[PDB]
Design a protein around this nucleic acid. Structure first.
Lengths: 54, 122, 114, 119, 207
RNA sequence: UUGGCACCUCGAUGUCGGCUCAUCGCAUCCUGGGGCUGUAGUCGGUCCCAAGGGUUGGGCUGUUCGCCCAUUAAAGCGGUACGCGAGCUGGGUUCAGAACGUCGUGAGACAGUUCGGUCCCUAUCCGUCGCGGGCGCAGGAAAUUUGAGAGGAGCUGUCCUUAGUACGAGAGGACCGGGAUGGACGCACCGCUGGUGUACCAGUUGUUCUGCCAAGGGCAUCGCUGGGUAGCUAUGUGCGGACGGGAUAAGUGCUGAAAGCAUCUAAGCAUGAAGCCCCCCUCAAGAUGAGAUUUCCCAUUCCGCAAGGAAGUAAGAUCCCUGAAAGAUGAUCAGGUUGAUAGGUCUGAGGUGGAAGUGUGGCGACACAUGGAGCUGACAGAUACUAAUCGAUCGAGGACUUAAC
């Protein structure tokens, strides 16, 4: 199977639609911020409700 | 569970030793025949003095399988050796005795002579 | 499986003694020919005990006329009338499916009456 | 269900027998995420044998704990550390011995690291 | 035609009256509450919504909290119609339960089948494997699409897909017993749908 | 089909036959229904309608075909690039090797035969089969739907009665109609029968290791067996093609004319098929003709005098997390501390089947007791003990002409 005819410059961009990556769910640490991501321990201070676990 | 080409040892004094299936009789059709199911067969090996000889095409009837007989009451009958009893055009058998134990489901078929000729109908 | 169970707490048959796999018990089987009820004896070696409450099973196996008869049965079914335990047995294992081969002395030698 | 972890059924046993030992020495490990969530199901069985302390109970636990000296200068094996230290601490607790805290992903492969601590 | 709906639990063996052995399901379907009477004077057709297996208030919404106000009971998860009962003998708020059925009522039963996941051409359609030896590389696969001249695949040529997840009626069952003490049905045979799924136990179309 | 012609293709259109997967045409093999019979019943010949469904397991040969074995309601033809090689097999023809007969003086030749002889491709597009993300459906939302339309199913054999009845010299043997039971095919599921089950349990060989014994670990396909729960399942079990309704084909007609009688037809009314349309089951309002009913949240704050535009927000949802009956990922579904969603811990169920250790019998290998003991993967029911914290993002203000209010 060999591609019978080249993809034009429209169809090439129309598969880039869902190809976009997305935001991370991000909030701030109530210790420091800014910012954390959701439910996982920050690199900022390393507190997580709220023990200072480095 | 006795389909085409299944060598069934015989269980009577009719002369035969090993019976080869050809075609289970029911329908278009089927490929299995558990217990009490009439088969068209030949005889591959025989005790040497016998009216049914080697290479003769005479029908037969299963009695036992290593496959189960499933009674409708939970209990299951399953033997350790396959079987045949050989029939001559009506359900009176050509054989004289019928060796070994016998699945009792034959009596619920039309084989009431075959049950009477056989020692442990269980 | 509690509410599975407590339905069938009623018909849990409670007129038989317990038994291990490797032993011999007699079964009293109610058997219909038309129209009466022979209570035919049944005899031989127990093997299987595939469990499950009402769904339990057991297999008495009987050599007869040189031929083995593998026969299962219900653990609480009403057709089994009475159970008479003849032998017990020191048996190493709990599923004796090897003796659907072994005839006949070494089957008997593994029937050590404990 | 259980987790295949991309390892053969013997490779997983050598996988899990190492990590359960390393919680005994370290008190905390930074594995990957499904190396964390799948480790808590074993250690909370393994600490459960610690509370017994039978001569039979220790000989079950030696098949998931290796032979590694845990504390220097006392020469304690990780087998000894369960029945001496850990079981003397968890006679209050009934389950949930190791809480798992997720950390961010790792650089070189994007793998979600995760922190296990006993508690 | 009467019909109630509910969860199932599993399979059992219940012997009865003979030496028999019956393959029996266990159904949780009591009790249903009439939430809304679909009427042909407004909607054209005749039906009754029934709700089942009430849930706690965190799981229920204000559009649906007010929907149970005509029956005046707790919010309730599983809602379906039933076209169409003998009209009516029902009032919105009457707790329909097991008491209708008996040992002898022939019953059709519908439910959403056990989804097995993305399965190939043999398992999804009963298609047959090719030769596993003799140098043949074609096995496990659906094979020839169609002819050459129409230059396309005819719609309906079976292919791999996601097997399961439909709703399946299975007909002509026999309800064994009635347990209004424990809210339990008992139906001969196999009933579609996985463990703890929802199952509508109708009355059949006979005879 | 063998052909004629050479008009697509010799900068390549893979040729025979099998395996899969089919559809379609009926000029019909059955099954449904009828005329005639050189049809007494039974079984036929033959001509009609009828494609809905079924249309087998071999032996032989590369074979299609063909014959034969035995069944069967029957074992239909035929097209679709003599269907189907970017789906497979090369057994033959027609690569080189190699022989045999024949022919030629010889190289070699032969639709004359025979043994051996690299069958390549990551799927671009349209198709097909499943899954999603937008948007629309004159405000946003949550449930349940209706059905225009789309599919699936559509096969039948026995047996017993009716009835040894009609029929028949007799032999032989019913029509119609009921009732039980199969075959094949299909749709489900695991309670039994089983299979499997690589973190379940027991035994065991070699070596290696925890100082040694005892006890265990490693590796040998999981070292090897013998068992096995949950799940996936078939050969296992349950169900299916039912009863119907409505118009029709070929028939069969009742009336009646033209053509005083006659005449199924021209006006008029019927009956009649496994055919058609529904009933049975599945999808389904993207059905832009965007349907329906129930219950919700409301009708903000600012700019633009205005048309309009933003920002904050309710009903609800989404990100994020624990997962599973779901599952490729998305999705669905159970759930997020007025919590059982998952793991653990208990109490169990099933599985394995008598733990270590101790004492005793035995010189010993081993047995016996403590003791259905010990060990347990997803299987059940409790328990906040652990992880589902924090929080964020999205989402309305309902155009206007007319009719009735």
């Amino acid at each position: 199977a060999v591609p019978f005819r080249r993809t034009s410059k429209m169809k090439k961009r129309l598969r880039r639609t869902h190809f976009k990556l997305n935001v991370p769910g991000m909030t701030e640490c109530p210790s420091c911020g800014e910012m954390k991501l959701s439910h996982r321990v920050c690199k900022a201070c390393g507190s997580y409700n709220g023990k200072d676990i480095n | 569970m006795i389909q085409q080409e299944t060598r069934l040892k015989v269980a009577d004094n009719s002369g035969a030793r090993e019976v080869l299936t050809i075609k289970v009789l029911g329908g278009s059709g089927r490929k299995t025949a558990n217990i009490g199911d009439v088969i068209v067969c030949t005889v591959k090996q025989a005790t040497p003095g016998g009216v049914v000889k080697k290479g003769e095409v005479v029908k037969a009837v299963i009695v036992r399988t290593k496959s189960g007989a499933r009674r409708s009451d939970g209990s299951y009958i399953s033997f350790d050796e396959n079987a045949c009893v050989i029939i001559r055009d009506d359900k009176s058998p050509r054989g004289t005795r019928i060796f070994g134990p016998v699945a009792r489901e034959l009596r619920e078929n039309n084989f009431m002579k075959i049950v009477s000729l056989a020692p442990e109908v269980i | 499986q509690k509410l599975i169970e407590d339905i069938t707490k009623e018909q849990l048959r409670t007129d038989l003694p317990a038994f291990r796999p490797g032993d011999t018990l007699r079964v009293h089987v109610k058997v219909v020919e038309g129209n009466r009820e022979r209570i035919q004896i049944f005899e031989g070696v127990v093997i299987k005990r595939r469990g499950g409450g009402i769904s339990e099973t057991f297999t008495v196996r009987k050599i007869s006329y040189g031929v083995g008869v593998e026969r299962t049965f219900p653990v609480h079914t009403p057709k089994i009338a009475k159970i008479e335990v003849v032998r017990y047995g020191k048996v190493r294992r709990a599923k004796l499916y090897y003796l659907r081969e072994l005839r006949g002395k070494a089957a008997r030698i593994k029937e050590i009456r404990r | 269900s259980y987790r295949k972890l991309g390892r053969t059924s013997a490779q997983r046993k050598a996988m899990l027998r190492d990590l359960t030992t390393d919680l005994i020495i370290n008190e905390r490990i930074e594995t990957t995420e499904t190396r964390a969530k799948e480790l808590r199901s074993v250690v909370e069985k393994m600490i459960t044998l610690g509370k017994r302390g039978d001569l039979h109970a220790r000989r079950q636990a030696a098949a998931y704990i290796r032979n590694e000296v845990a504390n220097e200068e006392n020469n304690q094996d990780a087998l000894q550390k369960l029945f001496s230290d850990i079981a003397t601490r968890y006679e209050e607790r009934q389950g949930g011995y190791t809480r798992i805290m997720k950390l961010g992903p790792r650089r070189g492969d994007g793998a979600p690291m995760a922190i296990i601590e006993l508690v | 035609t009467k019909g109630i709906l509910g969860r199932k639990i599993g399979m059992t063996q219940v012997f009865a009256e003979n030496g028999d052995l019956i393959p029996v399901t266990v159904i949780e379907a009591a009790p249903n509450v009439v939430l809304q009477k679909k009427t042909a004077e407004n909607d054209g057709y005749e039906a009754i919504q029934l709700g089942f297996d009430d849930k706690r208030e965190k799981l229920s919404n204000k559009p649906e909290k007010g929907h149970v106000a005509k029956a005046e009971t707790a919010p309730k998860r599983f809602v379906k119609e039933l076209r169409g009962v003998e009209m009516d003998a029902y009032e919105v708020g009457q707790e329909v339960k097991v008491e209708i059925f008996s040992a002898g009522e022939i019953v059709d039963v519908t439910g959403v089948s056990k989804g097995k996941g993305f399965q190939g051409a043999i398992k999804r359609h009963g298609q047959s494997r090719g030769p596993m030896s003799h140098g043949s590389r074609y096995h496990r696969r659906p094979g020839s699409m169609g002819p050459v001249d129409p230059n396309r695949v005819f719609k309906g040529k079976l292919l791999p897909g996601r097997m399961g997840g439909e709703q399946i009626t299975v007909q002509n069952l026999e309800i064994v017993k009635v347990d209004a003490e424990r809210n339990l049905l008992l139906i001969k045979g196999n009933v579609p749908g996985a463990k703890k799924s929802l199952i509508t136990v109708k009355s059949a179309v006979k005879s």
